[PDB]
């Protein structure tokens, strides 16, 4: 059940990809740590809720 992922290495030792291992010990997922591997998304639903979304080089009002 071990889960293996690559670390995003910031300061590299003078010694390439480094990994870390995770194992869940409990049946209830609420007990689990946070994966912190979070996908992002477009702001458009907030920055552009327009029915006709227009392109920035064209006149906003036409």
């Amino acid at each position: 059940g071990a889960q293996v992922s690559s670390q995003k290495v910031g300061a590299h030792e003078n010694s390439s990809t480094i990994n870390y291992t995770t194992i869940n010990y409990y049946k209830d997922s609420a007990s689990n740590a946070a994966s912190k591997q979070d996908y992002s998304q477009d702001p458009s639903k907030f920055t552009e809720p327009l029915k006709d979304v227009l392109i920035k080089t064209a006149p906003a009002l036409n």
Partner: peptide, 4 residues
């Protein structure tokens, strides 16, 4: 294992 489940290595991602």
């Amino acid at each position: 294992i489940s290595e991602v």
